[PDB]
Amino acid sequence: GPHSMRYFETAVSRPGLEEPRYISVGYVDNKEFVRFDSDAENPRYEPRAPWMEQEGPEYWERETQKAKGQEQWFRVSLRNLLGYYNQSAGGSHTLQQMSGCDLGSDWRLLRGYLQFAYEGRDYIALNEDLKTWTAADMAAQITRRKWEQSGAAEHYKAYLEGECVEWLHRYLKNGNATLLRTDSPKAHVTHHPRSKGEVTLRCWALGFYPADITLTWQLNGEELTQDMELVETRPAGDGTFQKWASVVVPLGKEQNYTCRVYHEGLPEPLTLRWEP
Amino acid sequence: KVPRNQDWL
Amino acid sequence: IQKTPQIQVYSRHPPENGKPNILNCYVTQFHPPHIEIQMLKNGKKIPKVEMSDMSFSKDWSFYILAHTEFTPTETDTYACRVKHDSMAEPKTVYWDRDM
Numbered sequence: 001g002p003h004s005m006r007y008f009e010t011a012v013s014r015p016g017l018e019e020p021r022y023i024s025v026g027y028v029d030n031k032e033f034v035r036f037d038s039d040a041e042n043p044r045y046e047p048r049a050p051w052m053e054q055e056g057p058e059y060w061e062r063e064t065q066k067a068k069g070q071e072q073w074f075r076v077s078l079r080n081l082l083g084y085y086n087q088s089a090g091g092s093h094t095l096q097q098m099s100g101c102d103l104g105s106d107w108r109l110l111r112g113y114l115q116f117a118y119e120g121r122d123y124i125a126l127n128e129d130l131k132t133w134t135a136a137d138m139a140a141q142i143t144r145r146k147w148e149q150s151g152a153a154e155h156y157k158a159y160l161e162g163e164c165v166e167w168l169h170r171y172l173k174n175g176n177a178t179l180l181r182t183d184s185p186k187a188h189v190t191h192h193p194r195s196k197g198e199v200t201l202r203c204w205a206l207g208f209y210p211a212d213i214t215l216t217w218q219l220n221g222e223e224l225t226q227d228m229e230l231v232e233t234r235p236a237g238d239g240t241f242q243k244w245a246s247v248v249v250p251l252g253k254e255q256n257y258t259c260r261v262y263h264e265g266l267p268e269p270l271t272l273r274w275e276p
Numbered sequence: 277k278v279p280r281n282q283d284w285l
Numbered sequence: 286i287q288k289t290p291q292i293q294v295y296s297r298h299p300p301e302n303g304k305p306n307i308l309n310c311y312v313t314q315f316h317p318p319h320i321e322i323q324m325l326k327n328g329k330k331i332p333k334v335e336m337s338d339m340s341f342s343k344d345w346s347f348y349i350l351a352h353t354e355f356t357p358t359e360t361d362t363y364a365c366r367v368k369h370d371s372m373a374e375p376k377t378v379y380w381d382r383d384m
Contacts, residue, residue: 012319023338060285063277066278070280070281081285088281117345119317120346136379152283164279232291235311260358
C-alpha cells in the first residue's frame with residue numbers, strides 16, 4: 001500500500017533579541033511519531049508513538065544533534081529573509097518546511113517533497129524531478145540562484161531517495177501492528193426538529209481511523225448532493241476521527257432516506273436509516 | 277530520520 | 286493576521302446529560318500560529334483546559350485541539366472563545382449538542 005513520511009518544521013521569530021522557537025514533528029502514514037521543541041526544558045527529539053521506543057540512545061542523540069543544527073539554520077534563514085523583504089527586525093515572522101517521501105509497495109520512492117514557506121505563503125519548492133526549484137517570489141529567486149550555485153537539490157534528492165525511503169521502511173517494520181491498524185466507523189442517524197413540517201436527519205460516523213471517509217444520503221436509492229450539509233472531519237482527541245452529514249426532510253418521510261458510510265476499515269459500506 | 281538542510285535561504 | 290480561524294466545538298462522545306465526556310474546540314486554518322483559546326461554562330472560564338501541540342497542515346495553516354473534561358446537562362452552556370491577529374475581535378462559538 002501507499003506509505004509516507006514527513007517532517008514538518010517551524011521556526012517563529014520573537015520580539016527583542018530573543019531566539020526563535022523551533023519545532024519539528026515527524027509523521028509516518030500521517031500519524032505523529034517524533035517531536036522536537038526548543039521551548040522544552042531539555043530540548044531533544046522524543047518518541048511520540050510507542051513503537052519508536054525500540055530505537056537506541058544513539059539514534060536519539062543523532063536526531064537531536066540534527067535538530068539543533070536545523071534550529072540554527074532557521075535562525076540564520078529568518079534573518080536573511082528579513083533582508084530580502086526589507087522588513088524591520090524584531091517582529092514576528094514564521095518559516096516552515098515540509099520534507100519527505102511517498103513509498104510504493106515495491107519500496108521505491110514514488111514522490112519526494114522539499115518545500116518552504118515564509119509567513120505561511122509558498123516560498124521555494126523542489127520540483128517533482130528532484131532537480132530544479134520553483135520560487136514564488138522575487139526574494140525566493142535569490143535563494144534559488146544561491147541553491148543552484150551550491151547544488152542543494154542534489155543534497156536533498158540524495159536524502160529523499162536514500163535515507164528517507166530506507167528509514168520509512170524500517171519504521172513501518174518496527175510499528176508493525178500499530179501503523180497498519182484501521183478502526184472502522186460506528187454510525188448512527190439522529191433526528192432533530194427544524195422549520196415547519198421539516199426535520200433534519202444527521203448521519204454520524206465516529207471512532208474511525210484513518211481520517212479518510214465518505215458519507216452519502218439517498219432518497220429512495222437516488223443520490224443527494226443538493227441540500228447536504230457536512231462538517232470537516234475532526235479529531236475525537238483519542239486518535240480517531242468524526243464526521244457527519246445531514247439533510248432536511250419532510251416530517252413523516254424520514255424512512256425514505258438512507259445514509260451510506262464508505263471507509264477502508266469496513267468489510268463493506270454501511271447503510272443505515274433513522275430508527276425511532 | 278530527519279533531513280539536514282544545506283545552504284541557507 | 287492573514288488567515289482567520291475556523292472553529293468546531295463538539296463532544297468526543299455522544300452527549301448524555303449527567304455523564305462525563307470531553308468537550309473539544311478544534312481550531313484550524315489560521316496563521317500566524319500564536320492563538321489564544323478559552324473554553325467557557327455558563328460564561329465562566331474553565332481552568333484545566335488541555336491543548337494539543339503545535340501542528341500545521343499541508344496548506345501551511347496551523348491547527349490545534351483544545352479540550353476539557355465536562356459533564357453535559359440539560360441547561361449548562363459551553364463555548365470556545367478564540368483570540369487571533371486576523372480578527373478584529375474574539376470569536377465565540379457555542380456548543381450545539383446536535384452537531
